Amino acid sequence: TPEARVLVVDDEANIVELLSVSLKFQGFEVYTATNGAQALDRARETRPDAVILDVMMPGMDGFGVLRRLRADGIDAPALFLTARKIAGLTLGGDDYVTKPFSLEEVVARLRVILRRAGVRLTFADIELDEETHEVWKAGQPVSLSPTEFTLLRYFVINAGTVLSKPKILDHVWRYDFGGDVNVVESYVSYLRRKIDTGEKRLLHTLRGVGYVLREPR
Amino acid sequence: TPEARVLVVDDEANIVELLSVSLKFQGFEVYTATNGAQALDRARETRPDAVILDVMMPGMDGFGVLRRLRADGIDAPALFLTARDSLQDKIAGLTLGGDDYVTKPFSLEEVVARLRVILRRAGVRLTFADIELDEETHEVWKAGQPVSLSPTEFTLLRYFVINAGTVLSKPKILDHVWRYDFGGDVNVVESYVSYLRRKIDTGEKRLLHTLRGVGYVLREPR
DNA sequence: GATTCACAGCTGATTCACAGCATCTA
DNA sequence: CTAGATGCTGTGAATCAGCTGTGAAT
Ligand SMILES: [Ca+2]
Ligand SMILES: [Ca+2]
Ligand SMILES: [Ca+2]
């Protein structure tokens, strides 16, 4: 059975399939629309658990549509896709992500709005607060940058899975990022000197394959 | 069980929705209307505990709508949404009792607070650590001694106290504390947090924290 | 004066590229 | 054995996030 029913609405088909492929892979049941009519129809046809909405769409905007769905009885929270004005995106049970986004941030925020509508991350001695973005190593606090935290959360969620540098970059970095994978090497080096300082090495290198967060064998 | 039954009357659909969503999320049972006839119909069927009326409306203004409700024997207290430039004298004389007003554009935090007061007055001190606030008088105490706050500094502080221990991003604060039509920079929140820290965060133990790239949180250091 | 808030200087954090060194393996 | 491939990390530049002082306007 799926994690949730998600309606993805954006006038850009490339943003729509990028989200639908990632979320379909993460266990979600995904329906799409590239306009307000299609959106209203699909939402009435499938009654989703949450809606991902491009804020800037030709003709009918999401706000008009949300008002109609909620007046029917569909109280599904919205995760707005906004450009980098439009305000009110954090009212009720809704939240938003700015374009260009990363796959990790869209799923993370989507999961928050769903949990909020209807619990710290740990691996060995690493503790993550998804709310505050606070980190601890052996009960001691460690300060991490936004990128360092997203990367650690990716590894923790995917503990014991070998993750290649191109895969990490496609999930952790924004989809408009134009550089190579040495940025991943740099951020693994920072993570190591901040949260892999204990007797046992937890973040491992497998040459030409990837990185893996696992307890030493 | 709902906090109260509220009837929201305004001619603009998205003002009604802005109000509806916020009050529903706060634990209120919200009924709506876009005119005086629907308003009287909803009031007869739902029997609201408070009514929120837009003053400037076509056909029949908010004052007209209230007069019709009261003529029907619906004595629920009212909260008027007034225009800044007009009916100044009429609003002063019509709010001497149980009814109150907020000027449009309003802050969602101020509407809700003013609704809780008219509901309370019709049949009271917020606290966090050594900070005390009177929701009715707008007085603030920091470790038993008074502190003078502006209207914006007061709405900001109450938002933090009510939501103590919860991380609040600058856009979330702007959406709730600032006037809904605010088209400015998040720096305004940075400014008012600096105003608050200078007055209420003055001891060895920090209460109002910054989590870089996340937001602000009011909590004891632990 | 009180107030709101725009704006800009400042600071330290953050992102990221780049290169030279280390280690691995063909 | 060596030599290229692959990975690590110090240096530095550019940008950014958040804090605060000044001042315009009401
Ligand atoms: Ca668009
Ligand atoms: Ca990519
Ligand atoms: Ca009106």
Numbering used by the authors:
A (entry chain B): 18 to 101, 107 to 140, 149 to 247
B (entry chain A): 18 to 140, 149 to 247
The study reports:
In M. tuberculosis, the response regulator PhoP of the two-component system PhoPR regulates the expression of more than 100 genes, including major secreted antigens such as Esat623. PhoP belongs to the OmpR/PhoB family of RRs, which is the largest family and contains thousands of proteins. These RRs have two distinct domains: an N-terminal receiver domain (RD) that contains the conserved aspartate residue as the phosphorylation site and a C-terminal effector domain, also known as DNA-binding domain (DBD), that has a winged helix-turn-helix fold. The deletion of either the phoP or phoR gene in M. tuberculosis severely attenuates its virulence, and attenuated strains are being developed as live vaccines.
